[PDB]
Write a protein that binds this ligand. Sequence first.
Ligand SMILES: Nc1ncnc2c1ncn2[C@@H]1O[C@H](COP(=O)(O)OP(=O)(O)OC[C@H]2O[C@H](O)[C@H](O)[C@@H]2O)[C@@H](O)[C@H]1O
Ligand SMILES: Nc1ncnc2c1ncn2[C@@H]1O[C@H](COP(=O)(O)O)[C@@H](OP(=O)(O)O)[C@H]1OP(=O)(O)O
Length: 179
Amino acid sequence: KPERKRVSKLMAYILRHSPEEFGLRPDVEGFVSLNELVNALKTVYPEVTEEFVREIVENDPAGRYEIRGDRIRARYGHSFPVSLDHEEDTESRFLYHGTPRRNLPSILKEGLKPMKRQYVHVSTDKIEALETGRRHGREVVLLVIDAECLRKRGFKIYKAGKNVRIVERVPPDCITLAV
Ligand SMILES: Nc1ncnc2c1ncn2[C@@H]1O[C@H](COP(=O)(O)OP(=O)(O)OC[C@H]2O[C@H](O)[C@H](O)[C@@H]2O)[C@@H](O)[C@H]1O
Ligand SMILES: Nc1ncnc2c1ncn2[C@@H]1O[C@H](COP(=O)(O)O)[C@@H](OP(=O)(O)O)[C@H]1OP(=O)(O)O
């Protein structure tokens, strides 16, 4: 529903990108006070309550958020450094990243890089990978990433969302296919 969606979009923006511009100071792990997040959200959507934020967190289908005690964080997507959980994805054999075709000259030479984020974000889900690439351009390619290649190279893959995984970078040898 549009109420849930518009408050969640604002939560993700505050918690991933501009907490300080709403007066919040994330701790090392990226958590802000839940009460303080609620007041920040209410500067935009005055109907928001803590109970509604708790409902958004628990019902989020991607696993975007985490509440711990009286604090809340985004679980990935940040454009500032945070220490996240190191729940390691050891089971996935391939992972996916969608990107505009125009990026293949750089990506296939340099690998995937975190760009303005802290981590490279990949997915266990091809459609969601492609839909993320579509945010950046109409002509997108599906990158297929060999998870064992990454692990062997010392790049741990972490369970950030239900489908989202994070990794420090993806060297080009680990990009097996671009479709
Ligand atoms: N070496 C490179 N050269 C050029 N472009 C590159 C390179 N490596 C990666 N890119 C592209 O640089 C761009 C970086 O765009 P951004 O928005 O930061 O990353 P996202 O598109 O993965 O979205 C991650 C999402 O996953 C979670 O939901 C988060 O919350 C996000 O919503 C991509 O097109 C890369 O392919
Ligand atoms: N329902 C929801 N809750 C929270 N956040 C949401 C969201 N639906 C979308 N977002 C985020 O909005 C940005 C633009 O994405 P579009 O609207 O172009 O698809 C992007 O976040 P960012 O700028 O950090 O990359 C998305 O995050 P996500 O990939 O988790 O949906």
